RNA sequence: AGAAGCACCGGCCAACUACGUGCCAGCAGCCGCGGUAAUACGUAGGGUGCGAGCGUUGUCCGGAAUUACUGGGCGUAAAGA
RNA sequence: GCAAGGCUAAAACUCAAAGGAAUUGACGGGGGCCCGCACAAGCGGCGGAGCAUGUGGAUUAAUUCGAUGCAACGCGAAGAACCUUACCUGGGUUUGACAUGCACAGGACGCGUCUAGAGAUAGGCGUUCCCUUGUGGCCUGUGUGCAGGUGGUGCAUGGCUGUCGUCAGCUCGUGUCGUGAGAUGUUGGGUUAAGUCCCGCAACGAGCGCAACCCUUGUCUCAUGUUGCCAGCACGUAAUGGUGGGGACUCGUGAGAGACUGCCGGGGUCAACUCGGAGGAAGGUGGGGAUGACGUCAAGUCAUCAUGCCCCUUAUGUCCAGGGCUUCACACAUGCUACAAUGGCCGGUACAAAGGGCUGCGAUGCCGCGAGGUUAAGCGAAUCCUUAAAAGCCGGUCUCAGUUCGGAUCGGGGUCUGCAACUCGACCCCGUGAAGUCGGAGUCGCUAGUAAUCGCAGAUCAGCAACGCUGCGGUGAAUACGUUCC
């Protein structure tokens, strides 16, 4: 997103409630995870090089 | 297309003709 | 579809009546996947009605599906300017189950409290010829032989 | 676009995941620092034309390995900068580091330098229809290669409008599974604006 | 979502495997202790000692 | 030592980049240009063609085998009463 | 010439064309063959009600921006009380929250306290380890190139995506025909889900496509035995494989086998293939998924990211407190609950699958009607928790009513999270008990473990408007003669 609101996000805001997580690559405010830290699109490309383990897609 | 051809001839034809029969009396036929 | 016809379902012997008609009549009635409550329910109006019949409950029932089965129906078709319908016969198979969602659509409808006995006067009024279902064979058939004029367009 | 990545399907099935680990609950902070050392790797170090990077993290030891075109400039004078990219990724990680910079054993069969390649190239400002014959030909020429098909899409020379234009030749299966497709796909910096290079290379069924 | 922005109904689907064995080797000796201890496991796998 | 200017630079047609303007100003023979990146408008630089001349107009011939004697055509293109 | 009008026959003006043949497509209320829940036969819905959500409009100080037939509208947004936030009011600031280049100067910083809505401003403590010995580390102060921009242009763009459409087509090289655009190959007879294949032919071949290789489900063999299993023994305390114990079985998961028109009968140039059978768990592609050819829509995205040009620098940058993105005479869109007896309620009683768990799952016991509260065992998990799945069966009551339906609505009282619950969270108890009695024109989905119906789980997430989205399983249908019509 914004630089200044990355930095917001990667220090350490009063109130705690207030913290929230970022995209780890591009700074996207949502569809942002948690195991991966790492928003949705920013996932998907990540996933499809291969750069990030235990990953591929499925077919049940 | 050649029968665009003869419909512009026939448009012209008949507004010609239409223009006659509007004055085929004192309108024209004095003059 | 485009490709023939498809194939149906086989439908095994019931349990308590050596019969195939009370196994589709049920699923007939079957509605939302309660199959207990409609096995339940059939077996409960044939074993209600056995009291006032006499008569074998499954020998009753094919007694009022002989009564209920259509033979030529009124299917509809457009040709020109108007749309009309064309007499057309009904091959059995399609024709008793026809007569028998006939029976479970105005059992739905009928004046009592509940469904059990509703359908088991259902059963016996059409066993003995005078029901709403009874009365719609005799008004779609009149309805189809003054289309009989139409019958030329058989597809 | 419409076309999925290979790389995407054959993961598993033909190739092989970039990064190797085990984890459970750090893995968040090691994807954090693992695209950061990305970053780094990829900033300042175009001229080598790096083709690939492993990362290999087992217990508090740190094994990164890198397949580039050139494995002269990153070493330089016997250890003047790949310790220097050394140095600038333990200050990054807080963890020793194996850093092994090893080769791609052929920079012109191998897609993700083919894209470079032109890439550059294009920002030099000549013709890309003399370019992606030249890849043509470059890519034709190992023991291995049964099919390329390279495609760039953007203005293209100062046009106005953009466009998308692909040459190929052989067999590129991009719908079989059993094809070990290699894909590549590079961003081209020029006055206009950017451009964009992606190959295939299909390099047999499998061994 | 496959889309950066506007399409829903395209998805893609990424999954996680993990996979876990057990051995349990009974007989104890001292002298295999270390040569449990220095072994050269693989990159990906993880080893526990209960 | 007293003595050079004119026209043009998208194709015909020989001769190109930048800045100012932004369907406006405007250019133009033709087909077209300019609606935010103009080799086509204004300016600058460069260049080309000329040069005491260079351009615009008008007139005529040519290209026009598009009045055909040289040297044309008429089933469907204009053209068999 | 009776007339109708015919014959002869201009110019002004205006345009850069008008035309003729042929080619490729596209289209036709043209023809033929065919396919698709396209129709048809059914099942259940929407449009009616209330609510949730998005959107148009409106209003406001702002109601951020994007998405606008299908293919925008439970879309970006897989979680707006703060934050997110891009919006507004105000309090500040302004080499800045952040990154690097150039000059003069030496602790940055951290605890705790005061005021201030907070941002921050101030007392004062702790204070430069490092030869700030010019050299090392960092930092502020003063500047100076900047940094920054969710500011514009998706009609300058890359990347990603939708869509026709998982429709079976799209093409290419050599050769030939034609002045040429182009044509043939790719047409013709069969066949297939398929440009799938056989026979002919100025065609000969190849590629992207279809197919298969991949995953999941459907059977069997070998090894395998913990946290999984219990057939023959022993123990069984409270009978909870609880224990010793065993490889029988399941199951787990590794390697495999099997399905390939493989074999037989009939038809067909003996071809492609086709109908029917034997064996087989599965038969002609077993089912589902992943898969989106050349391209189309100047389709979407400059707001994931990157980006060519254009634009601000005491402001569009930037920090903080509030409010707004949740408003409301209306309109549309997608959903949940209903309008009941195939049901309401009471009680008893069975049968799962897939996932989640350390910032945690909370077994038992106790308190409270309940949400919940407390002690605390065990569990990074085939171990323990989640967990009792719910619909289902049995018995009883209710008896067609705006009800023993519906659960919006309101008052009162609360729990939990979160500094904080009014704007604007979820859950619980009592009383209150609206619209709604099956919804017009019109319109949607669905061909089998499907529709329908019932719960369960997850991502996002402290909490959650979770009825949204993606998944798991219980019960479980009726119809398809057929292509006249849409
Ligand atoms: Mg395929
Ligand atoms: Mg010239
Ligand atoms: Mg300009
Ligand atoms: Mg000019
Ligand atoms: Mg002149
Ligand atoms: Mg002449
Ligand atoms: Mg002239
Ligand atoms: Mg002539
Ligand atoms: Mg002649
Ligand atoms: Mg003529
Ligand atoms: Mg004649
Ligand atoms: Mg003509
Ligand atoms: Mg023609
Ligand atoms: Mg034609
Ligand atoms: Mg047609
Ligand atoms: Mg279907
Ligand atoms: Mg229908
Ligand atoms: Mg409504
Ligand atoms: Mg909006
Ligand atoms: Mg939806
Ligand atoms: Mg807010
Ligand atoms: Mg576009
Ligand atoms: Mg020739
Ligand atoms: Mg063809
Ligand atoms: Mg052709
Ligand atoms: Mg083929
Ligand atoms: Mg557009
Ligand atoms: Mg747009
Ligand atoms: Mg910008
Ligand atoms: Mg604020
Ligand atoms: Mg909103
Ligand atoms: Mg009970
Ligand atoms: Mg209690
Ligand atoms: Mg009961
Ligand atoms: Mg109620
Ligand atoms: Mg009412
Ligand atoms: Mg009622
Ligand atoms: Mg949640
Ligand atoms: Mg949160
Ligand atoms: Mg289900
Ligand atoms: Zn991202």
């Keep these: 997103a914004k630089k200044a609101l990355v930095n917001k996000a990667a220090g350490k805001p009063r109130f705690a409630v207030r913290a929230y997580t970022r995209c780890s690559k591009c700074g996207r405010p949502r569809a942002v995870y948690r195991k991966f830290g790492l928003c949705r699109i920013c996932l998907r490309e990540m996933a499809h090089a291969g750069e990030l383990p235990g990953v591929q897609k499925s077919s049940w | 297309g050649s029968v665009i051809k003869k419909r512009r001839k026939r448009m012209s034809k008949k507004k010609h003709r239409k223009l006659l029969r509007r004055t085929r009396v004192q309108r024209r036929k004095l003059g | 579809p485009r490709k023939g016809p498809a194939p149906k379902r086989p439908l095994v012997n019931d349990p308590v009546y050596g019969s195939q008609l009370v196994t589709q009549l049920v699923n007939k009635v079957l509605l939302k996947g309660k199959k207990s409550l409609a096995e339940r329910i059939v077996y409960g109006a044939l074993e209600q009605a056995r009291d006032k019949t006499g008569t074998d409950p499954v020998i009753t029932l094919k007694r009022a599906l002989d009564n209920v089965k259509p033979a030529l129906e009124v299917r509809s078709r457009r040709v020109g300017g108007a749309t009309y319908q064309v007499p057309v016969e009904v091959r059995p198979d399609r024709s008793t189950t026809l007569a028998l969602r006939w029976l479970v659509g105005y059992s739905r409808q009928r004046r009592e409290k509940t469904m059990i006995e509703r359908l088991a006067n259902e059963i016996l009024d059409a066993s003995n010829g005078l029901g709403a279902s009874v009365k719609r064979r005799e008004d779609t058939h009149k309805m189809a032989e003054a289309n009989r004029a139409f019958a030329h367009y058989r597809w | 676009g419409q076309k999925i990545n290979p790389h995407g399907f054959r993961l598993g099935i033909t190739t092989d995941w970039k990064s190797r680990w085990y984890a459970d609950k750090q893995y968040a902070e090691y994807v954090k620092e693992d695209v950061a050392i990305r970053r780094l790797l990829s900033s300042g170090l175009e001229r080598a034309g790096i083709a690939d990077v492993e990362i290999e993290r087992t217990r508090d030891r740190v094994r990164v390995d890198i397949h580039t075109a050139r494995p002269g400039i990153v070493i330089g004078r016997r250890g003047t900068e790949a310790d220097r990219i050394r140095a600038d990724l333990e200050k990054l990680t807080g963890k020793q580091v194996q850093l092994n910079i090893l080769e791609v054993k052929n920079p012109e069969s191998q897609a993700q330098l083919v894209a470079q390649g032109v890439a550059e190239q294009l920002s030099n400002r000549v013709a890309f229809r003399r370019a992606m014959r030249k890849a043509i030909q470059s890519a034709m020429r190992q023991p291995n290669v049964k099919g390329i098909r390279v495609q760039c899409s953007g203005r293209l020379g100062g046009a106005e409008m953009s466009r998308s234009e692909f040459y190929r030749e052989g067999r590129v299966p991009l719908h079989t599974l059993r094809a070990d497709i290699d894909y590549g796909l590079y961003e081209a910096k020029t006055t206009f604006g950017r451009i964009g290079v992606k190959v295939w290379i299909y390099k047999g069924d499998i061994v | ?50």
Excluded: W
């Design chain 5, 1 to 50: 979502i496959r889309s950066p922005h506007k399409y829903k109904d395209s998805r893609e689907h990424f999954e996680m495997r993990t996979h876990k064995r057990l051995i349990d080797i009974i007989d104890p000796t001292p002298k295999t202790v270390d040569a449990l201890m220095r072994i050269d496991l693989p990159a990906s796998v993880d080893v526990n000692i209960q």
